[PDB]
Amino acid sequence: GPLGSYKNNPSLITFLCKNCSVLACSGEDIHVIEKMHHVNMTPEFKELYIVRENKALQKKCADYQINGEIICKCGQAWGTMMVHKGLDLPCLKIRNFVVVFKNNSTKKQYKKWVELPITFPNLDYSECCLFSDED
Ligand SMILES: [Zn+2]
């Protein structure tokens, strides 16, 4: 049975690949930016996703330089690889991922992180302005 308490913990939930369903990362293993942008500051995840050479995604004239479109092993557009002055911030899309609850044996498929009733942390990359070398 369930016999649980709360389910608003990103520790019980995890992200998977829609196409497949491989654990790419966990909610708790994710950071938020102004609760407006979802950036996955996971290094190990860099070995779970592959970027393909495509300009159909990234753009020159912009403020957020992208590398292309991130895709799982199978090749499922996990989202996109955003860059900030040379930073690495992979923006995944729940519309390409899945959410599996640990508390109870179930699998919920969302579209946006906003749909996630689970509360997330708040990590402001800007916090560090050291690396800042460019103008
Ligand atoms: Zn896959």
Side-chain angles (χ1 to χ4, degrees):
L3 316 317
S5 182
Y6 320 116
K7 197 188 68 30
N8 181 257
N9 216 303
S11 192
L12 325 149
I13 82 211
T14 332
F15 304 172
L16 328 158
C17 181
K18 166 148 98 175
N19 269 26
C20 298
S21 35
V22 322
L23 178 266
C25 221
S26 315
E28 64 149 17
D29 213 7
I30 300 264
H31 279 128
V32 155
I33 291 284
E34 307 198 66
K35 317 85 151 202
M36 79 178 45
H37 288 144
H38 27 92
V39 283
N40 167 298
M41 313 290 278
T42 330
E44 71 196 270
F45 170 80
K46 94 179 64 177
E47 312 256 353
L48 322 170
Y49 92 67
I50 330 181
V51 150
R52 263 59 200 291
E53 197 204 20
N54 165 88
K55 52 159 169 64
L57 270 314
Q58 92 77 231
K59 330 183 91 276
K60 282 91 187 83
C61 299
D63 194 48
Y64 273 112
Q65 167 69 14
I66 331 286
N67 270 215
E69 213 196 54
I70 49 153
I71 55 176
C72 88
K73 318 315 287 67
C74 317
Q76 170 64 6
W78 270 350
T80 31
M81 167 50 53
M82 270 156 65
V83 200
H84 159 288
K85 325 210 172 30
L87 199 52
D88 59 303
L89 330 91
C91 269
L92 295 44
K93 321 179 146 205
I94 269 188
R95 44 147 92 184
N96 305 312
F97 278 78
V98 192
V99 199
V100 151
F101 286 105
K102 198 193 311 189
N103 269 214
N104 30 307
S105 286
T106 315
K107 149 184 294 293
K108 270 57 175 268
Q109 210 152 21
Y110 292 88
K111 49 181 179 181
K112 290 155 156 160
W113 314 94
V114 46
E115 309 282 309
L116 215 46
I118 282 38
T119 279
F120 277 47
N122 313 279
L123 211 211
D124 285 294
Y125 87 68
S126 203
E127 285 269 85
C128 55
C129 197
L130 323 325
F131 309 131
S132 179
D133 185 275
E134 288 190 47
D135 288 23

mmCIF file of all heavy atoms in Angstrom, residues 17-22 72-76 78, ligand 1:
data_model
loop_
_atom_site.group_PDB
_atom_site.id
_atom_site.type_symbol
_atom_site.label_atom_id
_atom_site.label_comp_id
_atom_site.label_asym_id
_atom_site.label_seq_id
_atom_site.Cartn_x
_atom_site.Cartn_y
_atom_site.Cartn_z
ATOM 1 N N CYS A 17 12.899 9.649 -19.447
ATOM 2 C CA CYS A 17 12.777 9.951 -20.868
ATOM 3 C C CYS A 17 11.424 9.499 -21.407
ATOM 4 O O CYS A 17 11.102 8.316 -21.310
ATOM 5 C CB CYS A 17 13.903 9.275 -21.652
ATOM 6 S SG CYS A 17 13.860 9.604 -23.445
ATOM 7 N N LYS A 18 10.668 10.439 -21.955
ATOM 8 C CA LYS A 18 9.359 10.123 -22.502
ATOM 9 C C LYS A 18 9.490 8.960 -23.488
ATOM 10 O O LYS A 18 8.878 7.911 -23.300
ATOM 11 C CB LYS A 18 8.715 11.372 -23.105
ATOM 12 C CG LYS A 18 7.514 11.003 -23.978
ATOM 13 C CD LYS A 18 6.445 12.097 -23.933
ATOM 14 C CE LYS A 18 6.549 13.016 -25.151
ATOM 15 N NZ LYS A 18 5.435 13.990 -25.162
ATOM 16 N N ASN A 19 10.291 9.189 -24.518
ATOM 17 C CA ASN A 19 10.509 8.173 -25.536
ATOM 18 C C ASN A 19 10.768 6.827 -24.858
ATOM 19 O O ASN A 19 10.044 5.860 -25.091
ATOM 20 C CB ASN A 19 11.727 8.511 -26.398
ATOM 21 C CG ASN A 19 11.319 9.325 -27.628
ATOM 22 O OD1 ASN A 19 10.317 10.021 -27.639
ATOM 23 N ND2 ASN A 19 12.149 9.199 -28.658
ATOM 24 N N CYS A 20 11.803 6.806 -24.031
ATOM 25 C CA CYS A 20 12.167 5.593 -23.318
ATOM 26 C C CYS A 20 11.605 5.684 -21.898
ATOM 27 O O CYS A 20 10.416 5.452 -21.682
ATOM 28 C CB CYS A 20 13.681 5.369 -23.318
ATOM 29 S SG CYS A 20 14.423 5.147 -24.976
ATOM 30 N N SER A 21 12.485 6.022 -20.967
ATOM 31 C CA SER A 21 12.091 6.146 -19.574
ATOM 32 C C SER A 21 13.299 5.914 -18.665
ATOM 33 O O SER A 21 13.195 5.229 -17.649
ATOM 34 C CB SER A 21 10.971 5.163 -19.229
ATOM 35 O OG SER A 21 11.106 3.931 -19.934
ATOM 36 N N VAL A 22 14.420 6.499 -19.063
ATOM 37 C CA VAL A 22 15.647 6.364 -18.298
ATOM 38 C C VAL A 22 15.787 7.560 -17.353
ATOM 39 O O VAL A 22 15.581 8.702 -17.757
ATOM 40 C CB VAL A 22 16.839 6.208 -19.244
ATOM 41 C CG1 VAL A 22 16.471 5.345 -20.452
ATOM 42 C CG2 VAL A 22 17.371 7.572 -19.686
ATOM 43 N N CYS A 72 18.018 12.608 -25.551
ATOM 44 C CA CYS A 72 18.421 11.448 -24.774
ATOM 45 C C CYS A 72 19.231 10.520 -25.682
ATOM 46 O O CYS A 72 19.523 10.865 -26.826
ATOM 47 C CB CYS A 72 17.217 10.733 -24.158
ATOM 48 S SG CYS A 72 16.453 9.456 -25.224
ATOM 49 N N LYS A 73 19.572 9.361 -25.138
ATOM 50 C CA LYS A 73 20.343 8.381 -25.885
ATOM 51 C C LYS A 73 19.573 7.987 -27.146
ATOM 52 O O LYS A 73 20.118 8.027 -28.249
ATOM 53 C CB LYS A 73 20.708 7.194 -24.991
ATOM 54 C CG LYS A 73 21.153 7.667 -23.606
ATOM 55 C CD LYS A 73 22.115 8.852 -23.714
ATOM 56 C CE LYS A 73 23.488 8.400 -24.216
ATOM 57 N NZ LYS A 73 23.398 7.935 -25.619
ATOM 58 N N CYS A 74 18.318 7.615 -26.943
ATOM 59 C CA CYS A 74 17.467 7.214 -28.052
ATOM 60 C C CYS A 74 17.437 8.355 -29.070
ATOM 61 O O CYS A 74 17.475 8.115 -30.277
ATOM 62 C CB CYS A 74 16.063 6.834 -27.577
ATOM 63 S SG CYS A 74 16.016 5.799 -26.069
ATOM 64 N N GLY A 75 17.368 9.571 -28.549
ATOM 65 C CA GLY A 75 17.331 10.749 -29.398
ATOM 66 C C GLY A 75 16.051 11.554 -29.165
ATOM 67 O O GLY A 75 15.496 12.128 -30.100
ATOM 68 N N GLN A 76 15.619 11.568 -27.912
ATOM 69 C CA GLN A 76 14.414 12.293 -27.545
ATOM 70 C C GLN A 76 14.769 13.697 -27.052
ATOM 71 O O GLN A 76 15.450 13.850 -26.039
ATOM 72 C CB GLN A 76 13.614 11.526 -26.489
ATOM 73 C CG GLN A 76 12.479 12.387 -25.931
ATOM 74 C CD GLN A 76 11.458 12.721 -27.019
ATOM 75 O OE1 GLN A 76 11.528 12.243 -28.140
ATOM 76 N NE2 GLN A 76 10.506 13.565 -26.628
ATOM 77 N N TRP A 78 15.226 16.247 -25.135
ATOM 78 C CA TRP A 78 15.041 16.441 -23.707
ATOM 79 C C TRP A 78 14.731 17.920 -23.468
ATOM 80 O O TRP A 78 14.043 18.266 -22.509
ATOM 81 C CB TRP A 78 16.262 15.953 -22.923
ATOM 82 C CG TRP A 78 16.188 14.482 -22.511
ATOM 83 C CD1 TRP A 78 15.137 13.655 -22.588
ATOM 84 C CD2 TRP A 78 17.257 13.692 -21.950
ATOM 85 N NE1 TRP A 78 15.449 12.395 -22.120
ATOM 86 C CE2 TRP A 78 16.780 12.418 -21.718
ATOM 87 C CE3 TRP A 78 18.585 14.043 -21.645
ATOM 88 C CZ2 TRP A 78 17.562 11.392 -21.175
ATOM 89 C CZ3 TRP A 78 19.353 13.006 -21.103
ATOM 90 C CH2 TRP A 78 18.887 11.718 -20.864
HETATM 91 ZN ZN ZN B 1 15.099 7.495 -24.663
#
